[PDB]
Symmetry: D2
Subunit: 354 residues, 4 copies
Amino acid sequence: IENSAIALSGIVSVANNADNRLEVFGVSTDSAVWHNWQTAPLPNSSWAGWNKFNGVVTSKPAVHRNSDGRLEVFVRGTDNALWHNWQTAADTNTWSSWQPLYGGITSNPEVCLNSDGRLEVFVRGSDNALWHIWQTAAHTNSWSNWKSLGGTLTSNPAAHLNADGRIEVFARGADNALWHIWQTAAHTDQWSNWQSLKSVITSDPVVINNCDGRLEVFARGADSTLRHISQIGSDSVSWSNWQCLDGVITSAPAAVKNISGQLEVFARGADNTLWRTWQTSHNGPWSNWSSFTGIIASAPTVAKNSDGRIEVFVLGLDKALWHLWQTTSSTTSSWTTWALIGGITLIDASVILE
Amino acid sequence: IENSAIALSGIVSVANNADNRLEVFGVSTDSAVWHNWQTAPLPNSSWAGWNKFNGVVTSKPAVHRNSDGRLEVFVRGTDNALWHNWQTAADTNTWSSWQPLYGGITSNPEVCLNSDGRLEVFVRGSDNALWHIWQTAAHTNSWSNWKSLGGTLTSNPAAHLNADGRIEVFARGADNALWHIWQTAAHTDQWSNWQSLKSVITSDPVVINNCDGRLEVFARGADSTLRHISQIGSDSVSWSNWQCLDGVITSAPAAVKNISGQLEVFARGADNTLWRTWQTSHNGPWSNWSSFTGIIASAPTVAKNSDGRIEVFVLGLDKALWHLWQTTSSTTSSWTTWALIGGITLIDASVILE
Amino acid sequence: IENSAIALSGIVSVANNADNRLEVFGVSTDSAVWHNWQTAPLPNSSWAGWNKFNGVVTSKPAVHRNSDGRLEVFVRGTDNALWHNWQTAADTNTWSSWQPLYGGITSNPEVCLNSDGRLEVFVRGSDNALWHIWQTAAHTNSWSNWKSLGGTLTSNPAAHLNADGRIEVFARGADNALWHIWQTAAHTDQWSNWQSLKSVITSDPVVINNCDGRLEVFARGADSTLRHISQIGSDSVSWSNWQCLDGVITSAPAAVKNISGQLEVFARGADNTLWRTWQTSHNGPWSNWSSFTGIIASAPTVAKNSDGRIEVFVLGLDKALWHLWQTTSSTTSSWTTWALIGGITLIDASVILE
Amino acid sequence: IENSAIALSGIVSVANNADNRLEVFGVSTDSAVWHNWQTAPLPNSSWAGWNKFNGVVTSKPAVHRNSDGRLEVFVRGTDNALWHNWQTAADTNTWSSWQPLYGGITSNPEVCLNSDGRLEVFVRGSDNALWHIWQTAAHTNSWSNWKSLGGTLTSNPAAHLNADGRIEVFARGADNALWHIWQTAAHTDQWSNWQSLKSVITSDPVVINNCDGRLEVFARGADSTLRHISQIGSDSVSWSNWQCLDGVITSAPAAVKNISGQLEVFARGADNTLWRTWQTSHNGPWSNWSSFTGIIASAPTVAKNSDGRIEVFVLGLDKALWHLWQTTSSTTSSWTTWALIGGITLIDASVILE
Ligand SMILES: C[C@@H]1O[C@H](O)[C@@H](O)[C@H](O)[C@@H]1O
Ligand SMILES: C[C@@H]1O[C@H](O)[C@@H](O)[C@H](O)[C@@H]1O
Ligand SMILES: C[C@@H]1O[C@H](O)[C@@H](O)[C@H](O)[C@@H]1O
Ligand SMILES: C[C@@H]1O[C@H](O)[C@@H](O)[C@H](O)[C@@H]1O
Ligand SMILES: C[C@@H]1O[C@H](O)[C@@H](O)[C@H](O)[C@@H]1O
Ligand SMILES: C[C@@H]1O[C@H](O)[C@@H](O)[C@H](O)[C@@H]1O
Ligand SMILES: C[C@@H]1O[C@H](O)[C@@H](O)[C@H](O)[C@@H]1O
Ligand SMILES: C[C@@H]1O[C@H](O)[C@@H](O)[C@H](O)[C@@H]1O
Ligand SMILES: C[C@@H]1O[C@H](O)[C@@H](O)[C@H](O)[C@@H]1O
Ligand SMILES: C[C@@H]1O[C@H](O)[C@@H](O)[C@H](O)[C@@H]1O
Ligand SMILES: C[C@@H]1O[C@H](O)[C@@H](O)[C@H](O)[C@@H]1O
Ligand SMILES: C[C@@H]1O[C@H](O)[C@@H](O)[C@H](O)[C@@H]1O
């Protein structure tokens, strides 16, 4: 592969409502965001049906739950600015409609919830730097001015909280390596300088926390295999060496922590089916990749239900949304086969970065 | 000690608001519930001042955050029934005032949030059985009728979610041993039979989840030392043997999981000071107890701030509330000395069980 | 129990030959040491038959393999001095007969192999202090003079190597607590002062190393339950708190590390049957005790065969030696039932310490 | 690199004597084996001086300690047959001189000690299959006839015991992948079929056991980085996926388990200096490679001293043997700088496999 490739992304963004019902957000052929939700917080639930938000959008939507349980969606508009819309009350299907946050956006938006309850949004700006904007009070439609964190980005940003409440942001840099920058005090506008984690990545970075607190980062490497790196101390400075796992993947990875505390990674494999690998013991070795039947046309998007069961969403060859899930709350559970969440077809609205 | 002793309890109940500010609830000499909160979600924050809820109460208050971020407090009233009051909006100091849930209550109330967003309350009833009542919709003032789970209780109940979303309830039985009962499917009114975990306990049980998912239970034993037992499988049936730790304790324990994923336990020690022990490695051996300066007159109540720092509340010999906290987000952090949260004096309103 | 009780000991000492065949040493009704060995290094092997060493002895024999593979046995003689005899070549049943090491001995002897290949023997002397004597060259019948390490002993000593090659010795002191003393440099006559590990023990201490390097010590406590303590650092100074396991035991424990690296403990239980407990995960919680059919009249002595399978020796009610073993090299293996190693009856020749 | 490359090997074979003194074996410019030993079992000991064994050899020597403590060396002779010579007594510098074992050898010999005390030798034969021969009684100069295990080898074989006593042998196959074959019962001539572990390796395999029992295998991969794979069950069939570590290495790796039970790997790095990586926690992530000053001309050979301290041997640019070691028995110890073990120069006598 080209060292500047960005692997295929997931086709929807997912969130858990305040009652843990899953709700998915995607872009249809009308260039509008449509959403659909479980009617009860279990993977075998029926889904409500696809519902449209009026308005044309020009990026993949990002969704996050506010600290008062209301979902809020962020998306680039036809004016290349940032727009958002929110549930007006937790677990209710009444939304505010799109409202402006301005700026000039050249990536998909990324959203993170600070540990003091304030949402914060990260984007690549018109100068290819990292910019951000935040709620000035928890779960309130009152936002800061736009501010730059500098750098040069060549991927979408990925943000995650450290165990001590400090946001850390990861992104590919101008040298195609993974860089990162972090708050030096929790939920405060005081940030480090940019630092390189060195390698070469060919996907957006994917970040998860392990049970020990520590962040782990997953990405596709230059040889098209999964690689990963982890924090080895109590700060954002001390990291392991990179490790790669054998097996060519053809999409971004998606990572999840199962209810036994072990990590699992899902990715589209070299044969265009869904592949899965899991840690066999704590911090442990990784299993050989296992394959699920069925050709898929996007990266997976992963979520967990109220009972811990993992559920995976993909685009099918018919350009509709399919999903499968674990049959039991159990690391060795069998899985269902792909089922259709029918009613619309989806397009990949991800911002083209070059 | 007597095998039917119940060790001294904590003097306040604490919760984190939606923005993670700590808020404490206690009973003053007027037999009313008073509360106080941090003005910002950090341990060195100033506190707002003690504010009264009108109404006379006859138990320790229990508090839990709803899935929409609103705090809700439960307490026994002068009529021996259950009463509750709630924040009318997340992170706001406007409350509903006490509203009735009826029933007949002979213990302190215990509250648990189901993984489908519904609060559920557990109490000992007038027949000494375990009774419960629940929200019929997530974060809504719409409640079920009272229902019995049977048994015979001689302690307050303690409830916790398993990793798969099933509530499990622990309580001392008529033989002074620890018993438990559990949902057999997550957030459903389908329950097991009562089963004994065998020993003899002389405090209320204290339950926490470890990073591996598994529940761990802590209690004082018949020889006045801390003992503990843990789940060793993926279900509620398979448990370890009990282990005891040397050192006489003179209150209920309080347990917390620090931001490195290790467990710590706090208790009033044999010299009436606060003692602390921590796991030195994963699942590991426990440290010798360490002592903090200062005589204390209750069990500790423990909480974590937005930046991970642990904070401990106790009754002082002056009958006021004192607290101390970690200076840094770090397992080996030093601690502050006791500081006063002045303005009222507190009484122990715990229901007397015999 | 009395705080100065010493629990019942094992009836034989066992060693692995250079080819890993098990060989057992015990004292018969003629007050002579007799031995018997496997004919091949597997638990289902036939045994050779009981063979006598000429000479009357007055303690339990201790056996250790030299660094050149020759077994060597140590025992107190009718003159209260230390005697030894050795295989004249590895894996051969030709022995030297008893030869004198003099001194005055008031405990059973304890033997440890230094990491420079020299045997070293620890005993309580006529002044109740700890004394020792060592080979001055590896696997050579050339010994030092007797030297005192001081202290006051009220149990037999137990010695074990730390991971860095320093011998550490454990023994009950005059206050019935567990004390210890250690080499400050590996395989050198340079020793620490005595230090207390505090509790009260009612058996000889039993010491094993875990996979992490660290020593763990097991003993019966004042309430007749198993207790244990472990090193938590890289030196001999830093230890955990003591923990107890529920369940009354009526003999010394015996500990072994199974081939998955987890610890298992065997002891005679409160019903006079053999009980077993194992660590369920690394450093983990301990299982409930499991019982084997059959009344036993000594503590267990445990060993491992060439294929990893655990084998347990006990005195039966007929005063003969019985054993059972794992059917497969596997932590969850089933076990055989007791089988007789017939031909002599055994007596407990342990030195009476008070 | 070429997929059929075999990376540069270590220049000496090392063993611990019965008293744990290190002794090294290498080939000098006269094509004879010379050896040198520590005079005391500590890394700062003086060495005795280089001593010659008479006889011309045509492979790297392999050395193993017998179960009676006597070292024994194996080497290919001028007739392409296998020869051996042994210490006539443990810890003594009197040797038997070279004695014939016949056969026809096309690799370096590899030696393994069965858990019943019998040495067993593995070689590639004249038909490129794996052949072996064994002692028919423990630590005795009585050997079996040569027997074939089949296969097709394109590297030297590497043998290691599983925790249950079964020998397992690893070697590169005709497809440049790593293959293996194993005893199906401990120390018995009953073997599995050959099975592939799949990848492509460009060094001999290096095998070590972890504390959990399980084997781990390290090799250089097709992209010249270190890769590794581990057993994930209790048998020889169940393995993890392969993982690679970033960093180009230019020699075979050498692995050792330090006294805290963690693995460390040493290799010549891309800048021709010695590099080291270690596991930061159990099973854990690996550290970034650290470099030692000094250009080296072979792979490292690693050993541990009687006090646990790691010591590393390499060929220097002057064609002599150099070594360095840890200053303390401690995972975070500093290291010495290279010191010369002077008196002869060494050649790489490894059999050229293509
Ligand atoms: C998402 C928003 O939808 C509106 O209808 C458009 O007019 C805005 O430019 C923006 O794209
Ligand atoms: C997000 C920011 O919006 C502003 O309007 C621009 O001037 C910046 O370059 C950046 O794109
Ligand atoms: C993953 C899905 O598998 C199914 O069999 C197909 O019918 C869909 O188009 C989709 O590709
Ligand atoms: C908490 C409630 O306060 C009210 O004022 C009382 O009248 C009720 O009985 C109840 O105790
Ligand atoms: C909580 C329950 O309230 C009801 O009114 C009573 O009849 C029950 O015994 C129980 O006390
Ligand atoms: C824990 C507290 O320590 C302080 O020194 C005392 O003044 C208080 O009364 C309280 O007992
Ligand atoms: C073990 C030794 O056996 C000999 O026969 C005795 O004469 C010695 O005193 C000693 O007891
Ligand atoms: C083992 C030692 O033997 C010597 O002969 C005695 O004088 C000492 O007290 C001690 O008993
Ligand atoms: C442990 C053994 O169990 C057997 O059944 C008995 O016959 C023996 O006497 C011995 O007590
Ligand atoms: C190692 C042996 O040395 C002897 O001197 C030679 O004659 C043999 O062929 C063999 O090489
Ligand atoms: C080691 C074996 O030696 C024998 O003499 C040969 O016939 C075989 O091919 C093999 O090389
Ligand atoms: C590793 C060694 O480092 C030293 O500085 C050099 O003098 C030697 O030749 C050798 O290369």
